[PDB]
Write a protein that binds this ligand. Structure first.
Ligand SMILES: *[C@@](O)(CO)[C@H](C[C@@H]1CCNC1=O)NC(=O)[C@H](CC(C)C)NC(=O)c1cc2c(OC)cccc2[nH]1
Ligand SMILES: *[C@@](O)(CO)[C@H](C[C@@H]1CCNC1=O)NC(=O)[C@H](CC(C)C)NC(=O)c1cc2c(OC)cccc2[nH]1
Lengths: 305, 305
């Protein structure tokens, strides 16, 4: 039993974390096979960051301009290409620690593990969720650019995020491993705001099932609601609408506890209208939306990786 | 910026997790060099765990009664012995992924990272804190015995916890890597109850320092107390008394903010006596206690490994 914010074991990613230096800028790279992936603004100077023409700046660079570091071993760049905001540095040596990998673009509401890195060395691992406004509530310091977000299925690591910047509100934005930004953000040194951030509803419902599975039942009530009537109240409190797919995903959680999904919705409806009155749920004074139904099932059901 | 629970990179510990089977019972083991460490109750069947005589059970066990597997590959046991509640199995092969390691016994309040494992395959990693009643509020499922808790100091990995059981209350208990239980618990199929939990006072002070390092400093009292006077008032609110390593460990955080430890102690006593009056600190208004002063230094500074 128990329920913690759990990230995937990071060992498969640590073997790919390298250091990419170009000029006087240093960030992190992901060394898969004979390619090294890193944010493209490593090639930028301090003056270039304001308004960078990247294909312009990239054409003015060469292979020997990039300093790639893997441990205490300098990796030689034998070629360079650019895919959106991601730089691709081909090297002479392949990574023996390359796992089975894939490049996916997660949908908002999904979760992934972040391996915070500085100068190509892993600092810490933690779990994030892609918020509906395509930002993440991460923990990043200058030099964390190039850190990747990931999920592991069987022995396959599915990369989905690369860190790029920090918004003025403390949240963070980045790209997938193809270079496409999550959200309306761009890789320039400007103050960028995001859209209004809604609450991932189906994540809150799975979190409540996790509390019931762990013996916390103070929030349940003897009422039920229709899917539309719940979405009507949920929309009023800036919650994403619950879909028939979301209800289907919560199926196993409803089966284990015997509480219908539409029953849990009446509890979340009550919680939004009345508050928690100073009590806690799973030790939290707030409604938590950073756990997917899989995250709860993989913990509470007993699934292992 | 961004502050959240952050676990150590689990790669170095991943390469030390193995499977230990005795008859029909399977748990997890820690393989460092040519010795595998695991809970001693692996030599038990279902009815053996009720009232086990561990010295009498080990006398009827041989080296070939032990199945040690790295993945699916078996490591032959060339020697077995017992230290308290852990089992030591000498293996014919030395682990090439063995890092520089240590066996340490941590104090209630210190944090570590748990790498949850099932059948020798790491499942997830999360940060825990040792509660003052010597339990941990973990997240374990059947087959998780042998999962280790650890801290990383530079290139050294310090092992400090080996999981053993789950209390009726939902929390968990275990031993260090020397076999000695944390608390008054024993490895048996017995209903065991921990003592009354308290708040890790040194950890809320580091968290208040973490808030001061950022924006929130609204709770600064401009008052002081003696170490003795605060300890007497803190115990009246189910808070742990401050020891000596507590005051000295808060040193770097006090020098960074210029706010003395005893000055911060009076700010916290003001928050215990009159509450927070609907004000929030670092987001959640719940007085977090699972961040050590190192967790603040390590996160706010970007210490890598
Ligand atoms: C990378 O590590 C550098 O390659 C760095 C990581 C973030 C900054 C510190 N903490 C982080 O998460 N990324 C940046 O510094 C980026 C630069 C590229 C072009 C994206 N810039 C920002 O994150 C940034 C710039 C500004 C700003 O200007 C003006 C004004 C307000 C906020 C802001 N964030
Ligand atoms: C290990 O996997 C056993 O190898 C197992 C892990 C716990 C069980 C599931 N989740 C866990 O954290 N450990 C145990 O089963 C131990 C075995 C002891 C050390 C011999 N037992 C318990 O954790 C346990 C026993 C009892 C109990 O009795 C009956 C009554 C109430 C709670 C309880 N927990």
């Amino acid at each position: 039993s128990g329920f913690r914010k759990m990230a995937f074991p990071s060992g498969k990613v640590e073997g790919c974390m390298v250091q990419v230096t170009c000029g006087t800028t240093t960030l992190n790279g992901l060394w898969l096979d004979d390619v090294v992936y890193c944010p493209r603004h490593v090639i930028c100077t301090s003056e270039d960051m304001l308004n960078p023409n990247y294909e312009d700046l990239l054409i003015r660079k060469s292979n020997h301009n990039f300093l790639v570091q893997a441990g205490n071993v300098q990796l030689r760049v034998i070629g360079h290409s650019m895919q959106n905001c991601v730089l691709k540095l081909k090297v002479d040596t392949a990574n023996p620690k390359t796992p089975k990998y894939k490049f996916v673009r997660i949908q908002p509401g999904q979760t992934f593990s972040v391996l915070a890195c500085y100068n190509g060395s892993p600092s810490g691992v933690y779990q994030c969720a892609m918020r509906p406004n395509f930002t993440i509530k991460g923990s990043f310091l200058p030099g964390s650019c190039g850190s990747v977000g990931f999920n592991i299925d069987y022995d396959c690591v599915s990369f989905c995020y690369m860190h790029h910047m920090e918004l003025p509100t403390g949240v963070h934005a980045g790209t997938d491993l193809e270079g496409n930004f999550y959200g309306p953000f761009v890789d320039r040194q400007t103050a960028q705001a995001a859209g209004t951030d809604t609450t991932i509803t189906v994540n809150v419902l799975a979190w409540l099932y996790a509390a019931v599975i762990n013996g916390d039942r103070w929030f349940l009530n003897r009422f039920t609601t229709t899917l539309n009537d719940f979405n009507l109240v949920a929309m009023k409190y800036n919650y994403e609408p619950l879909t028939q797919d979301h209800v289907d995903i919560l199926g196993p959680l409803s089966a284990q506890t015997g509480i219908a999904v539409l029953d849990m919705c009446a509890s979340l409806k009550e919680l939004l209208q009345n508050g928690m009155n100073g009590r806690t749920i799973l030790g939290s004074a707030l409604l938590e939306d950073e756990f997917t139904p899989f995250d709860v099932v993989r913990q509470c059901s007993g699934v292992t990786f």
